[PDB]
Amino acid sequence: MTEYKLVVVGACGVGKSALTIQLIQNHFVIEDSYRKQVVIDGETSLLDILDTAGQEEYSAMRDQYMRTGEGFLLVFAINNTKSFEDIHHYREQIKRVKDSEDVPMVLVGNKSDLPSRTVDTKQAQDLARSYGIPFIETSAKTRQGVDDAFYTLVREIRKHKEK
Template sequence: MHIAPRHLHPSETYDPTIEDAYRKQLVVDNRMCFVEVIDTAGQEEYATLRDQWVREGQGFILVYSIASRSTFERLEVFRQLMLRVKRNRPIFVLVGNKCDKTYEREVSREEGLAMAKSFGCEFLETSAKTSHNVERLFMNLVRALRQTRQAETGPVMLPRQGERERRRRCIIM
């Protein structure tokens, strides 16, 4: 687990041991947005880049496997790292992935809910294999980012020419 939505990419060729980036166009509440997902897969060799990505990131998905207690227990370390690097209060979503593997469960749903409550964030269980709640995760995070941006900046004003692409883009780690 790490600060990116690791294991949320249903692909046979996905290798969770390498850094990767994904860019996706989404329509959330009838408004288009571009989402960039940076997945460091928890690798320490990306520590310098990770700090830069955290500074630039707007939303963060803390992912653990429900079938691995050790990934759950490391979440606070990653959260503290992001809080230290990020100047303003970042938006987090806590995700228990691999919910299709209930027979291998090591972390209960109640434990995930309790941790999310202590972090002050939303909680979802997902499955990249079956795509359960994956779209919902990104939609909810985009909505939360939009609400935060609107609360900070006031009413939405049309951007000037050239600013449109930059302002519509969300970076999620």
């Protein structure tokens, strides 16, 4: 089977852990990684997901863990404008460690189940279009779009590996 190293990044409290746990265990709730065997478009895939946590620091060991990622989920929360404005920073750090302008990534607007949204869908769609990447709205609470976010990311890695 093909293994894919995925990293989930984004601002404090956006739901990076809740998204990973919902994917792995189908439940709603320190840095660790989680493995899950899945079938995507008929191909059995082993997803190895790093749920980013800890302090902001740029040691060689921190860069080496992040560089291990083949694709990244850039997560913001639809009710947190600051988390959306922080997406640029996370994308910047991914391109730096991967040393490439072309890295598989998916923009994820999480907490779509909450009312009182502050980031409009159109604004996130236009940003993703500028980056040349997919945008998916998710809810780790109701599971809406969770599988679609990780599977779309695997499809982006496949597109990158084929080219």
